[PDB]
């Protein structure tokens, strides 16, 4: 509904996606319908990006949460600089946090099992503050994203 553009809902989506990448999803009912749809499309994008950008992704050394945030914010600023927002660009935000969590799992100097909660936090901040209005105006996650991306 209209409130799915607020921080808690977005943070849960961002955290769910990292838990999918790390193979530690929440128990019970597990992820919502939105998360289930998002994880398939975001993962497909993630794999393509990892392949197509292999050479320039080898240059990055994500040694801490702070450097992950700095790189995330720099990349997002450049990706979104032209002011255009659409669902494909929103999906790439999730794909990119998946790349970052994988680099951290290998490169973080002071690894901490809560790290994915910190990464997904700054991802949610960006999505909410920079794309949340567009998301709301385009039907949110339920009436916008899921309607367009759920299976045919």
């Amino acid at each position: 509904g209209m409130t799915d553009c607020e921080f808690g809902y977005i943070y849960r989506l961002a955290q769910d996606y990292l838990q999918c990448v790390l193979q530690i999803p929440q128990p019970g009912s597990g992820p919502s319908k939105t998360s289930r749809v998002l994880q398939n499309v975001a993962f497909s994008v993630q794999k393509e990006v990892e392949k197509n950008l292999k050479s320039c992704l080898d240059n990055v050394n994500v040694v801490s949460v702070d450097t992950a945030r700095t790189l995330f914010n720099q990349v997002m600023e450049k990706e979104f600089e032209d002011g255009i927002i659409n669902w494909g660009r929103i999906v790439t935000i999730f794909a990119f946090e998946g790349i970052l969590i994988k680099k951290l799992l290998r490169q973080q100097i002071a690894p901490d099992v809560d790290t994915y909660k910190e990464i997904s936090y700054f991802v949610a901040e960006f999505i909410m503050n920079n794309t949340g209005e567009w998301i709301r105006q385009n039907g949110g996650w339920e009436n916008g994203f899921v309607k367009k991306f759920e299976p045919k």
């Binding site: 994008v45 950008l53 990055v60 990349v75 450049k78 494909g88 790439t92």
Partner: peptide
């Protein structure tokens, strides 16, 4: 220099997604 390269790659991947669902 790779910050801009990554961002350009994400813009391209986003366009591929949009081309599919739209």
């Amino acid at each position: 220099q790779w910050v801009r390269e990554i961002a350009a790659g994400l813009r391209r991947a986003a366009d591929d997604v949009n081309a599919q669902v739209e």
